[PDB]
């Protein structure tokens, strides 16, 4: 079919790249703005998340879809910074275009970026810091403020700081051959409206959204040794031989409930609704029935309370029974009204302890953004506790590393130093884009910040304390502030994997030479 080769394809690759790059430019930084997407189904979705946009984004260019899969891999590896990482592919491929039109060979561009990022780890070793960082009184709050970038939660992040920290405090467990980590992605988030952001409650346990059929049951259980059972089977009314089968099936249901009553389970979790036959057995046995449960939420209950889901009741023989090993354990069961509904609160579980988060917002479009923003912050603390090395935030990292690459280019020399200079100018778009979203001047703070880092490497003792060297930048007032007063920092694993995952991503665009379009059937 259509076959077109030459340098026009690489010029078209960056043209389609810069076209979709404008999507994440306005959403970068705490002051970034959201954008509305039309789903053509009558509704719309307003999101600044690059992972959600690139998924729905329609790209008619074959190479433009590579950036879509790049954000998907960064969600499992990192889980945050979607618009603060992928955005570099705009100018990085644009500066390489000037080298393609010149006599620079693509391998020099490829090997130039590899030697730059390989030796960049030693440059990062200067800005690293331990997990203790300052004198304390703020520990996981400083890393919780990392999610302020690219998101609008920075205004309400004051009260939400202690909510995220305390949610991951009691979920501690032992895994990874004895390593102590927090099993994230297991936190339940409930959507609610009313009051304000400061009224958000943190539940140190499991929260279930359902409706209790009979209010006369022991809704609130006082004391320990609470047994909870889980059954995937549906016990209800279901299909003169028709009346005889109805009586035989009713006896089978009452027999299976009798096995649960004999086990002493205080809470019975069912997938579907409960008929009137099972409700009469629960009141006499002082058991609270639960209906309309989601299978995905029941999987976390099996790990938390310790109640394994029962697919079917059977054994090696033809006897049906419910074993006692499928019962869960917790400290107490408390039921309170949460947002025009009564939810079950399971706290103090035996096997594993979980946590639930209740959020408040304006509308459903606001809660969708507030949920994913705080959900991505859970991975920020998780990835930070894995590697104690941390780097300061504020965009001062990209401006500082580009100065060391200037003398590093003179060390290597030859033709590989020109690609290093172009790679240093490519990283300068990150601090300049933040100035555009902050309605400030671009080169104003960039030229000044690089002046403090220019003499940073020239200081022999570090003369007295730090006259020039410092970290952090103030986007609101457009001034250079210290990282201690600003209180902003970012994890190292997020910054290293940023350019590391983008390494093979940008080169893949450069490796494209001949473009061929086959006509569809």
């Amino acid at each position: 079919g259509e076959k077109i080769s030459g340098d026009d394809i690489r010029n078209q690759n960056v043209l389609a790249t810069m076209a979709v790059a404008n999507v994440v430019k306005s959403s970068l930084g705490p002051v970034g703005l959201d954008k509305m997407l039309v789903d053509d189904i009558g509704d719309f979705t307003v999101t600044n998340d690059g992972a959600t946009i690139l998924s729905l984004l329609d790209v008619q260019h074959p190479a433009g879809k590579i950036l879509v899969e790049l954000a998907q891999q960064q969600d499992r590896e990192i889980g945050d910074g979607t618009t603060s990482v992928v955005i570099i592919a705009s100018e990085l491929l644009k500066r390489a275009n000037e080298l393609v039109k010149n006599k620079i060979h693509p391998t020099t561009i490829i090997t130039g970026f590899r030697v730059a990022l390989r030796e960049a780890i030693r440059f990062i070793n200067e800005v690293l810091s331990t997990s203790v960082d300052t004198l304390g009184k703020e520990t996981l709050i400083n890393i919780a403020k990392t999610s302020m970038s690219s998101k609008i939660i920075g205004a309400d992040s004051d009260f939400f700081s202690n909510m995220v920290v305390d949610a991951l405090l009691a979920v501690k467990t032992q895994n990874s051959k004895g390593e102590i980590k927090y099993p994230v992605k297991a936190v339940n988030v409930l959507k609610a409206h009313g009051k304000s952001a400061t009224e958000s409650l943190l539940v140190p346990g499991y929260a279930l959204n359902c409706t209790v059929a009979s209010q006369a049951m022991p809704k609130r259980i006082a004391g320990g040794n609470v047994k909870i059972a889980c059954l995937d089977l549906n016990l209800q009314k279901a299909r003169e031989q028709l009346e005889q089968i109805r009586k035989r099936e009713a006896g089978i249901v009452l027999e299976r409930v009798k096995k649960i009553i004999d086990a002493g389970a205080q809470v019975v979790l069912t997938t579907k609704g409960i008929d009137d036959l099972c409700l009469k057995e629960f009141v006499e046995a002082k058991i609270m029935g639960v209906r309309r449960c989601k299978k995905e939420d029941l999987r976390r209950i099996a790990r938390a309370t310790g109640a394994t889901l029962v697919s079917s009741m059977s054994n090696l023989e033809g006897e049906e029974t419910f074993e006692s090993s499928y019962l869960g354990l917790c400290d107490e069961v408390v039921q309170a009204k949460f947002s025009d509904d009564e939810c079950i609160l399971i706290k103090g579980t035996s096997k594993h302890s979980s946590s639930s988060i209740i959020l408040r917002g304006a509308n459903d479009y606001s809660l969708d953004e507030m949920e994913r923003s705080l959900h991505d912050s859970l991975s920020v603390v998780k990835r930070t506790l894995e590697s104690g090395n941390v780097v300061p935030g504020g965009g001062c990292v990209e401006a500082a590393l580009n100065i060391y690459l200037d003398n590093f280019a003179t060390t290597v020399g030859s033709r590989e130093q020109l690609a290093i200079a172009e790679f240093a100018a490519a990283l300068l778009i990150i601090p300049k884009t933040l100035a555009v979203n902050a309605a400030k001047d671009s080169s104003e703070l960039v030229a000044k910040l690089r002046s403090y880092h220019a003499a940073s490497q020239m200081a022999k003792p570090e003369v007295k304390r730090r006259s020039y060297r410092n970290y952090g930048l103030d986007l609101i007032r457009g001034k250079i502030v210290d990282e201690i007063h600003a209180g902003v920092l970012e994890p190292t694993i997020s910054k290293v994997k940023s350019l590391k995952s983008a390494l093979e991503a940008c080169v893949a665009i450069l490796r494209i030479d001949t473009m061929i379009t086959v006509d569809p059937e």
Partner: protein, 380 residues
């Protein structure tokens, strides 16, 4: 695209707000709609207008969910609050697309505007005791003036005020008033009602069963209240619930906010003149977008002038001078477009009416400013 995409979003809410300008007050006008199917809907309520119309502008679709939130609280007179969200968008034309003002700077100015607005709301605060049945009677009759059930409300609104106080009481005073069960009986006279205190199905007085074509009568003595309504026509029961069941918001708002504000669009008159005075003390970059909010506040009372057939330029000259000099209790007569103050006008509205109006307006206005552009064709 970019700033050009926001211009289409401002005109989207501006075109919708201009339709509901005449939907406020007892003089409110009506609007006729023509669908591609050929059906016509003529009504003065903007609730069914936004639901039936399918707009091609993605920004106007967000106002449909906002109307559901405003109608969940009161629903009568709160539909025109969307105009305030549309006037702010049109107010940014000399700033956003001309001075290149950053949206967050405007949003930050709206945060100080929403905070200063609540202070002005507390300035017009006029508490009143809820123990007086005559004072609460004229309060629920405020929204009745837009209907012909005014003289019918004598035997109607008295049943609603007595039933809410039974299910309200205290706890704060927060309680659930949804336990009430209202039964509607078609046919008969509207003057015929049923006074029943108890649960409809110790030392009970009497037990009897009446004769009704719908169902029988049963009394349950407790140690909860129901309402049996007999309509004066067949389909009149739809309008009866709007003047009684939907009127329960007045009884809920007086318990949460006993204070009273000028009714009939007379509240924001003292707010606009006070907001301009609070702007002179700011003395900053944000002063211009902050002071320009008062220009959007005076557009709401112009709807009454457009309904009264007056000149909004010349009439508001003397009207704004009364609120900024004489007192903040002055108001505007919506019927004839007169300077008669709210003191002799006899109608007062709770503060929460304007609180939830401004709160939902600022929260909806900033979200529209946070949208850079709109794209289509994703094929989800």
């Amino acid at each position: 695209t970019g700033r050009q995409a926001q211009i289409s979003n401002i005109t989207a809410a501006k075109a919708v707000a201009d339709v509901i300008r005449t939907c406020l007050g007892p003089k409110a006008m009506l609007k006729m709609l023509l669908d591609p199917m050929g059906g016509l809907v003529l009504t003065n309520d903007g609730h069914a207008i936004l639901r039936e119309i399918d707009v091609a502008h993605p920004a106007a679709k967000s106002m449909l969910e906002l109307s559901r939130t405003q109608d969940e609280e009161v629903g009568d007179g709160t539909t025109t609050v969307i105009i305030l969200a549309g006037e702010i968008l049109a107010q940014c034309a000399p700033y956003l697309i001309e001075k290149n003002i950053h949206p967050v700077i405007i949003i930050q100015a709206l945060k100080k505007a929403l905070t200063d607005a609540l202070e002005v709301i507390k300035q017009v605060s006029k508490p009143v005791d809820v123990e007086n049945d005559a004072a609460m009677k004229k309060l629920i009759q405020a929204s009745i003036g837009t209907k012909y059930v005014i003289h019918w409300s004598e035997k109607m609104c008295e049943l609603a005020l007595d039933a809410v106080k039974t299910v309200r009481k205290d706890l704060f005073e927060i309680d659930i008033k949804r336990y009430v069960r209202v039964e509607k009986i078609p046919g008969g006279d509207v003057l015929d009602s049923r006074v029943l205190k108890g649960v409809l199905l110790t030392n009970c007085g009497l037990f009897k069963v009446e004769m009704i074509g719908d169902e029988y009568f049963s009394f349950l003595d407790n140690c909860a209240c129901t309402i049996m309504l007999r309509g004066g026509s067949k389909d009149i029961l739809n309008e009866i619930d709007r003047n009684l069941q939907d009127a329960m918001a007045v009884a809920r708002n007086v318990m949460l906010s006993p204070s009273l504000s000028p009714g009939g669009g007379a509240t924001e008159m003292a707010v606009s003149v006070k907001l301009a005075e609070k702007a002179k003390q700011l003395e900053g970059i944000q002063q211009w977008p902050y002071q320009a909010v008062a220009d959007a506040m005076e557009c709401i009372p112009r709807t009454l002038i457009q309904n009264a057939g007056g000149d909004p330029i010349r009439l508001l000259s003397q009207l704004r001078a009364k609120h900024a000099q004489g007192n903040f209790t002055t108001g505007i007569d919506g019927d004839k477009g007169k300077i008669v103050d709210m003191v002799s006008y006899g109608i007062w509205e709770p503060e929460v009416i304007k609180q939830q109006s401004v709160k939902t307006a600022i929260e909806s206005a900033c979200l529209l400013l946070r949208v850079d552009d709109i794209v289509s064709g994703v094929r989800k």
